[PDB]
A paper describes a structure:
Cyanobacteria and red algae use extramembranous antenna megacomplexes called phycobilisomes (PBSs), composed of phycobiliproteins (PBPs), to harvest light. A typical PBS contains an allophycocyanin (AP) core—two, three, or five cylinders of (αβ)3 trimers of AP—and a set of radiating rods—stacks of hexamers formed by αβ protomers of phycocyanin (PC) and, in red algae and some cyanobacteria, phycoerythrin (PE). Here, we reconstructed a cryo–electron microscopy structure of the >10-megadalton Gloeobacter violaceus PBS, with diverging, conformationally mobile bundles of rods composed of stacked phycoerythrin and phycocyanin hexamers, stemming from a pentacylindrical allophycocyanin core belted by auxiliary phycocyanin hexamers. The bundle-shaped morphology is maintained by linker proteins, including the multidomain linkers Glr1262 and Glr2806, which are unique to Gloeobacter.
In GviPBS, the “3 + 2” core extends to the sides with additional PC (αβ)6 hexamers (Rx1/Rx1′) that lie coaxially with the C/C′ (αβ)6 hexamers of AP and support the rods. Glr2806 is responsible for attaching Rx to the core. Its long N-terminal arm interacts with the A/A′ and C/C′ cylinders, while its REP1 domain binds inside the Rx1/Rx1′ cavity. Although mass spectrometry could not cover the entire Glr2806 sequence, our data unequivocally confirm Glr2806’s role in attaching Rx structures to the core. Consistent with the mutagenesis data, we hypothesize that there are up to three Rx hexamers on each side of the core. Furthermore, the coaxial position of PC hexamers Rx1/Rx1′ with C/C′ core cylinders brings several PCBs of those PC hexamers to distances of 27 to 31 Å from AP bilins. This is expected to substantially facilitate EET and indicates the special relevance of C/C′ hexamers (a hallmark feature of the pentacylindrical cores) in receiving energy from rods and auxiliary PC hexamers in GviPBS. A high similarity of PBS-related proteins between G. violaceus, G. morelensis, and G. kilaueensis suggests that all of them have similar, bundle-shaped PBS architectures, yet differences in the domain structure of, e.g., Glr2806 linker proteins in G. violaceus and G. kilaueensis, indicate that the number of the core-associated Rx structures may differ. Because the Rx belt encircles the cores of the bundle-shaped PBS, one may expect varying efficiency of PBS stacking in the plasma membrane in G. violaceus and G. kilaueensis.
Numbering used by the authors:
A (entry chain X): 61 to 263
B (entry chain C), C (entry chain G), D (entry chain A), E (entry chain K), F (entry chain I): 1 to 162
G (entry chain H), H (entry chain L), I (entry chain J): 1 to 172
The structure:
Amino acid sequence: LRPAVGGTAEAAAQKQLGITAVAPASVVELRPNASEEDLQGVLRAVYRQVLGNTYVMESERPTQAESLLRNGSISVREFVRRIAKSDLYKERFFNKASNNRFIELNFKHLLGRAPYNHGEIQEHFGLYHKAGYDVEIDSYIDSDEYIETFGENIVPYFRGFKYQTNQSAGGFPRMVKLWGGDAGSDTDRGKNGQRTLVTTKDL
Amino acid sequence: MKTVITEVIASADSQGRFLNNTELQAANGRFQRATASMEAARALTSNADSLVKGAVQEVYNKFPYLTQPGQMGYGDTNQAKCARDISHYLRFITYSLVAGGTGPLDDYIVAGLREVNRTFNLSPSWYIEALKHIKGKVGSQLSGQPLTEANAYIDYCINALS
Amino acid sequence: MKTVITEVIASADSQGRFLNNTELQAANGRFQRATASMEAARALTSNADSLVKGAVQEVYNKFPYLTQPGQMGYGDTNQAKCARDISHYLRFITYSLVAGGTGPLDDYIVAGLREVNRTFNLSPSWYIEALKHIKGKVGSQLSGQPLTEANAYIDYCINALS
Amino acid sequence: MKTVITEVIASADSQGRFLNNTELQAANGRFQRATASMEAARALTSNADSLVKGAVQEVYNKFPYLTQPGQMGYGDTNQAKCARDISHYLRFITYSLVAGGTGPLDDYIVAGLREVNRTFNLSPSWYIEALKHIKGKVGSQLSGQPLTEANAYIDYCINALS
Amino acid sequence: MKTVITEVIASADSQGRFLNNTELQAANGRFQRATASMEAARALTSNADSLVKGAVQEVYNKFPYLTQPGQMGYGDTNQAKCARDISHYLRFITYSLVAGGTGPLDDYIVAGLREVNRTFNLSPSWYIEALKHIKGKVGSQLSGQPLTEANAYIDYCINALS
Amino acid sequence: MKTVITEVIASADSQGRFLNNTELQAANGRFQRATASMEAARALTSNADSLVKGAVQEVYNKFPYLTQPGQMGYGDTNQAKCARDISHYLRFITYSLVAGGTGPLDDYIVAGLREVNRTFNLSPSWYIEALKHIKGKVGSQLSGQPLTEANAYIDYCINALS
Amino acid sequence: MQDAFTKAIVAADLRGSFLSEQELNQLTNLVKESNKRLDAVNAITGNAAEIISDAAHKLFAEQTDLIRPGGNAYPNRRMAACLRDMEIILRYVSYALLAGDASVLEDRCLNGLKETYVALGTPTRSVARAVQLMKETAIGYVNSPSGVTRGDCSALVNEAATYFDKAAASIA
Amino acid sequence: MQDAFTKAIVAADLRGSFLSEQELNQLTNLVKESNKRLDAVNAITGNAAEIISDAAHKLFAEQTDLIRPGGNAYPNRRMAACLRDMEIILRYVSYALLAGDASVLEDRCLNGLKETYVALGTPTRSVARAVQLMKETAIGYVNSPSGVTRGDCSALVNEAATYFDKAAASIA
Amino acid sequence: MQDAFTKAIVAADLRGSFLSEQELNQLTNLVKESNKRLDAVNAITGNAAEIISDAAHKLFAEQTDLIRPGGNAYPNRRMAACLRDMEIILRYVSYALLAGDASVLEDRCLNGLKETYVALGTPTRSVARAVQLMKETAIGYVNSPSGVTRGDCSALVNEAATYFDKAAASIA
Ligand SMILES: *[C@H](C)[C@H]1/C(=C/c2[nH]c(/C=C3N=C(/C=C4\NC(=O)C(CC)=C4C)C(C)=C\3CCC(=O)O)c(CCC(=O)O)c2C)NC(=O)[C@@H]1C
Ligand SMILES: *[C@H](C)[C@H]1/C(=C/c2[nH]c(/C=C3N=C(/C=C4\NC(=O)C(CC)=C4C)C(C)=C\3CCC(=O)O)c(CCC(=O)O)c2C)NC(=O)[C@@H]1C
Ligand SMILES: *[C@H](C)[C@H]1/C(=C/c2[nH]c(/C=C3N=C(/C=C4\NC(=O)C(CC)=C4C)C(C)=C\3CCC(=O)O)c(CCC(=O)O)c2C)NC(=O)[C@@H]1C
Ligand SMILES: *[C@H](C)[C@H]1/C(=C/c2[nH]c(/C=C3N=C(/C=C4\NC(=O)C(CC)=C4C)C(C)=C\3CCC(=O)O)c(CCC(=O)O)c2C)NC(=O)[C@@H]1C
Ligand SMILES: *[C@H](C)[C@H]1/C(=C/c2[nH]c(/C=C3N=C(/C=C4\NC(=O)C(CC)=C4C)C(C)=C\3CCC(=O)O)c(CCC(=O)O)c2C)NC(=O)[C@@H]1C
Ligand SMILES: *[C@H](C)[C@H]1/C(=C/c2[nH]c(/C=C3N=C(/C=C4\NC(=O)C(CC)=C4C)C(C)=C\3CCC(=O)O)c(CCC(=O)O)c2C)NC(=O)[C@@H]1C
Ligand SMILES: *[C@H](C)[C@H]1/C(=C/c2[nH]c(/C=C3N=C(/C=C4\NC(=O)C(CC)=C4C)C(C)=C\3CCC(=O)O)c(CCC(=O)O)c2C)NC(=O)[C@@H]1C
Ligand SMILES: *[C@H](C)[C@H]1/C(=C/c2[nH]c(/C=C3N=C(/C=C4\NC(=O)C(CC)=C4C)C(C)=C\3CCC(=O)O)c(CCC(=O)O)c2C)NC(=O)[C@@H]1C
Ligand SMILES: *[C@H](C)[C@H]1/C(=C/c2[nH]c(/C=C3N=C(/C=C4\NC(=O)C(CC)=C4C)C(C)=C\3CCC(=O)O)c(CCC(=O)O)c2C)NC(=O)[C@@H]1C
Ligand SMILES: *[C@H](C)[C@H]1/C(=C/c2[nH]c(/C=C3N=C(/C=C4\NC(=O)C(CC)=C4C)C(C)=C\3CCC(=O)O)c(CCC(=O)O)c2C)NC(=O)[C@@H]1C
Ligand SMILES: *[C@H](C)[C@H]1/C(=C/c2[nH]c(/C=C3N=C(/C=C4\NC(=O)C(CC)=C4C)C(C)=C\3CCC(=O)O)c(CCC(=O)O)c2C)NC(=O)[C@@H]1C
Ligand SMILES: *[C@H](C)[C@H]1/C(=C/c2[nH]c(/C=C3N=C(/C=C4\NC(=O)C(CC)=C4C)C(C)=C\3CCC(=O)O)c(CCC(=O)O)c2C)NC(=O)[C@@H]1C
């Protein structure tokens, strides 16, 4: 009958960390015969996740790509790959940043997690230098992790902040360094510019 | 800012490759055009006060009601804001001429333009009428390749407003 | 194939945008270079038979062992394959000159080169020696901007082999 | 479209759950509101001809220039297109009242509105003036909860135009 | 480093499962092979000085040109680096025997091999000739399952160079 | 089905790599264990009728209520389904012994077990009771490494039910 | 992507031959007319919004059906889609005009378009009429002197016409 | 990952030398005891569900607070997470016992675990107590396997103990 | 994936029966010959690069057309792709030989291959000829490994041959 002394509520930890909207992140799936209302939801979700809650002006919207998604010519997975290869992505996350910062940005944006070890950095830095940017971006989208979790119709969502099967222990603290909050973003447009949140020293 | 030079460098970096003759040829094209672009930029800068005042008056001639009371053209603050805005447009056009790309115009004016204009109830048609006035006067001032450069940057704005 | 023209068009398409002055300036740079590049291409084409013969002989002089029996230089089929390969290199260089990009060289020669050369046990050093021989002879044939164009495409190959 | 019923079903489906008391309570809220919403819809339908005529005339009074020659208000075709557009707005408002959501308004009017208006140079302010006229006249016709329902859908349009 | 033990553990970890009889059977195979692998490793270690000397001499016999002046084989520093490299190969072969996987060879030698050899102009063929020399001499030293183990790790290197 | 052999091949395929000594060592472990595993499998097959009869009776003794009317143990169909289910478990255990992995058990029994058992209201404790009875009788029949193999597959089931 | 130069190279490669002097001459002529070509591409880009608007106004006057309820360009979502399509086709025609080859138009814009329209229930003949209306407007802008040195641009105009015509024939 | 063999090679590599006969002898001893090691790993895997259950029962009897309202193991969502964590730690200890080296435990399980717990507000000392309770159960199974040849397993039991102890020390 | 053991179980399961003594006998014989099978798998992997190279040289001597301009093995990009394909097929045949079943070969390599080749325009009969040339080289290595104990490997050679033959028949 008597309560626990400490006595936090369930969700207290999430409340305290500010991960309460993403710890169990909602999953948005594009469904067949989707309404126009339904498609707009998916697009919003994509832009938020893939571009790191940075603002996209109406001039920057892709439009032709969305034409395909509405048609069914492409899947959510293909759409995500077009956005990641686009100059919208490249300008923010790639051109100003270093590779170290770019790689971890890609994990957060596309996989929804933090890099688990310095070997992931080593692999993706190596790919870029041998095969350039597009091959790199393809790796994340064409990976068992991507394919098993999201597959084709699910928009990527935040997987960190919950235990994933091959996760290292460093994975949850690293997601905390990557997450600024609901109002956070990963924006190039800052005083310091794009810097590495997750050092090599950390990995 | 998008310029010929930044764009070639960006492409090379994406491929992770040293710049090749393909990129350097493009770069050469920018540097050759620069003489005509500079000539345009100097002329627009020299006539900028007169260009702006005529541009603003043309908007008031085309839309007489603005000047009438209870309307956006009425009052000194409103009229001053007009001259400020057209001056911004000229400034970013001359910047684009010198930069060798539309990037200055794109980053300063084009991004967010539609949202800003909606919120403040600023009609794209007023700006377009001013730019068209400028285009006519520039045509008198410049000829040939200078003129071509000028006209292209003014046209870019007009299409973005449209 | 990557050329100045295809690259600007591809960029515009990726952004879903009409071609603007930034792109057209790059395009102009290709068309200005074209006169020197065509002159280079004609000289390489006219002397291609002699260029290939000398290049092959240079390889045999630089590596005397190849000519000895049980070696890759020995025998008619092997020697014929040498002349064929050097001719390919020249042909794709002239194509790149006329195309206004390294794209012809990249698609036909550079892609897959390392894997193919490994499997067939073809040394990069033989090719490099032949290309350098050509570069010296071209230097006699061409001068100024034609020479600069020629040298760039020959150097691209040399670096890819290296 | 978006209605209370479609939205609760969509939520349940996203979580992959059977509808629970939470959803059914929401649904009951829609069915209770229906009596007020129907009354509003019938009144708007009865006066729709008069509402549109007055709304169009109000636009002409608020912006006298439009009626002058060479302007969008001038000519039978133009005036007919005005009456058509305002009538559409009323029709989609009555549909939204009956549907129990803004979904009919969203799918027919709000989606693509900005791009269409830009291309055809149709000012949001003309529509907003007509809607506000209707809102005043509706206020005379309806009272209480019917009036509240009507006002909300007219306001939704006004905000979307704004 | 890939070994039988690390690979079974990695598989289990990937599925997030406890090690089962499937894994333990695999692990037993590594521990049974270990006695033959250790015997091979001891023999390679005992004759490693002689194996390296003969291997280096074989390279010079197979490619006589290297020894001539201005060539990679010529000079003390060059010859010293040859002996160093062959020694490295032997060392990583014995490590792979003891580890129960190709992982030692893979991480130390095979990764980056091609890029290093290209930059320093080191021919894969010289190494292959040395490894083949060793393989013949090992065959004299070892028999049966020790010999089989040795031959597999030498073959792995030869294929990686190829 | 997960077996030692399929798992090593799957790993190789994922890396896109030829099978190496690391994989072949694992494979050797499977083939050596096979002698003990076959002996276990033959013993379980020979005594399968007796093992099942005793297992079913043990469940009825451990939970006397089941046999009483209105309970799941009562009646011929129910008793028949019990004997069928225990027989399935034994069959998949012998399959796993022969296959050299837990894969037969995993694919046929373990996947979907919890959902099926919930819907049909089948207690894991009844199965666990039967398996433990079998384990005791097998212990009488087999010794040494055969016994160890048998025990591992029965234990896998017990943990999956738990 | 392919351009007129690249197309000639590909042909010569299949023959395994150095480009012929006649082939070279054709390419040299393309370089000679390149300034005029750049002017034409500029004209389309500079007047792009006007071209689409003028076409759209004419289309909807000609075919009242599309804008009525039950029409394919009703309501605003559909009308917006229609205007988007017109802009895309014009973009690709302009790309083709710079390239000197229709491949970019054919490979990206045109491929599968008719099938898509048929599935949607969009009337292909109306789409084709829109492309023809755009053509007449666009050709006028290239034709106008516009403070550009006066010359004969007839070959460039004809080439532009063909690209428009290809697009229309594919859709129709 | 690292195992005992891999660790020895890495050391010898830094010296740049062939493994010494003494180092070889140590490795041979590991191979000699490998059957016992396999039996120990089997004992943990075979009894894994029982190990966790027995630990959990003891933990919740010792610390009533965790299961009371507001407790860190209350309500079902949290209780489920607690049981999951215990299973993960046991898995990694078993991995380390097969490897003969604690690195897999340190690199994947232990590093950042304490930080995670502190951020969550999970009481680290209780987590450590859970690992100690699991240890006692597990070691019992290893010490009394069924049908196995009688022998001294004490060195392997001590090694298992150290892995549990490392985990506890990291977490606390 | 499937292996020889797994295949027998699946059959017995469909009958819903304990494996028959006859079925068991076949499996026992597979275990008896497993050492020879391991040697054969080793022979292919150890000589894999030579097998592909030797095949490639023979193929291009037989079919000069593929390497000329217009051929499917011209230019370097295509030649590289051809060599990649040969290596993939050999990999899967070696996997099948370890498994003792061709299913892995069929499901991962062979399924869809003929359709892919027809779309590409790759000549399937030449691909099949390459697989036959690889087979002759590979079988030679299996037949003559160095320092293996002398024995009859004929059944293993025949089994290898069938997997090569399956691949060839599927491709063409
Ligand atoms: C060579 C002169 C010296 C040297 C180099 C060296 N570097 C690494 C590892 C890395 N180097 C980088 C560098 C970059 N990151 C970036 O984003 C950029 C610019 C875009 C660069 C240049 C990175 C990311 C790594 C770490 C990841 C990786 O290894 O791929 C090493 C390897 C060290 C290791 O232990 O991993 C080395 C050796 N080292 C010397 O000794 C030279 C003097
Ligand atoms: C001139 C054609 C007409 C006119 C214009 C006018 N503008 C405003 C207000 C704003 N104008 C801008 C525009 C810009 N801000 C920028 O940063 C840039 C890019 C560099 C531009 C071109 C902005 C943002 C505002 C709104 C906020 C502000 O006050 O600065 C007004 C006042 C509208 C108001 O009530 O806020 C007016 C009237 N004036 C005329 O008389 C012409 C009709
Ligand atoms: C000349 C410096 C030396 C030499 C060369 C030689 N080359 C080959 C064989 C090939 N060379 C190529 C190269 C190309 N094929 C292409 O498609 C392109 C790009 C368009 C190139 C540059 C290829 C792919 C082959 C292999 C296939 C074939 O035989 O056609 C050989 C024979 C290689 C062999 O052993 O099979 C030789 C010897 N010959 C000399 O005398 C010089 C040392
Ligand atoms: C009335 C306030 C003013 C006016 C309006 C007017 N409208 C148009 C043209 C269009 N109106 C619409 C709007 C709709 N179409 C729809 O499908 C819906 C939702 C179901 C609406 C509300 C559209 C799309 C058009 C353009 C295409 C068409 O002609 O049908 C015009 C003509 C625009 C032109 O310049 O071509 C006019 C003038 N007329 C007046 O008198 C007021 C100023
Ligand atoms: C021997 C067959 C021939 C020869 C060899 C030689 N090697 C080098 C230089 C290097 N060798 C290596 C190789 C390794 N370094 C490693 O880290 C490993 C893995 C553990 C290996 C196998 C490397 C990296 C170098 C280059 C850098 C260095 O100097 O260490 C040379 C000199 C190369 C140069 O261009 O100066 C030589 C000559 N010498 C002979 O006589 C044979 C023909
Ligand atoms: C024996 C311990 C007790 C008992 C059992 C009993 N079982 C069922 C029904 C099912 N049993 C299974 C189990 C399996 N089906 C499979 O495919 C496999 C894996 C190969 C197993 C192990 C299934 C799925 C069923 C349900 C479908 C069916 O009816 O066939 C019943 C009847 C279920 C019911 O709800 O009525 C019973 C009673 N009977 C006893 O006496 C013991 C207590
Ligand atoms: C305008 C002249 C005519 C018209 C057009 C119209 N189009 C659609 C829908 C689509 N149109 C396209 C076409 C393209 N997508 C592309 O990416 C490209 C280039 C490769 C083209 C040209 C697509 C894919 C769609 C479907 C997806 C979407 O709706 O955005 C519509 C909408 C039809 C509907 O019911 O959804 C319309 C109305 N219709 C007319 O009546 C005009 C003659
Ligand atoms: C044909 C569509 C119309 C026409 C064109 C025309 N243009 C020129 C000359 C030039 N045009 C340009 C234009 C550009 N060069 C560039 O670099 C760019 C993009 C940055 C453009 C737009 C230039 C540089 C010239 C040369 C200088 C000059 O002004 O003469 C001519 C003259 C012939 C020529 O090819 O130079 C002509 C005929 N003329 C018409 O009347 C057509 C309607
Ligand atoms: C049980 C003995 C104790 C307990 C556990 C508990 N843990 C969580 C939450 C998490 N646990 C982990 C831990 C891991 N992640 C890893 O990477 C590893 C090994 C590599 C482990 C062990 C993680 C990441 C979480 C957060 C994600 C999740 O909740 O799924 C909780 C829940 C905390 C919350 O409020 O959500 C609990 C309760 N708590 C106790 O009371 C015991 C002492
Ligand atoms: C120590 C934890 C307890 C113990 C172990 C023990 N085991 C053996 C002997 C063997 N252990 C096995 C078992 C396996 N070999 C494998 O391949 C696998 C996985 C597939 C297992 C589980 C084998 C083969 C043997 C040898 C044959 C035999 O049955 O004797 C011993 C004897 C000494 C030795 O290992 O050589 C012992 C002591 N027994 C105890 O008393 C401890 C409590
Ligand atoms: C070599 C014997 C012959 C040859 C080969 C060749 N193949 C391609 C292209 C592809 N080949 C494949 C085949 C596979 N991919 C796989 O993953 C597998 C297993 C499932 C196989 C066997 C595929 C998918 C392609 C297409 C995409 C790609 O290139 O990776 C080519 C290139 C085709 C072209 O002309 O572009 C060639 C040349 N052709 C010959 O001449 C040989 C007889
Ligand atoms: C057939 C391809 C040729 C052949 C084979 C052959 N092999 C053996 C004997 C053995 N084969 C091995 C080899 C391995 N076992 C493993 O676990 C591994 C990977 C780690 C290998 C490569 C072993 C252990 C033996 C037994 C011991 C021994 O060396 O004799 C034989 C002998 C009889 C048998 O059936 O095992 C034969 C016949 N011999 C030929 O002549 C063919 C060309």
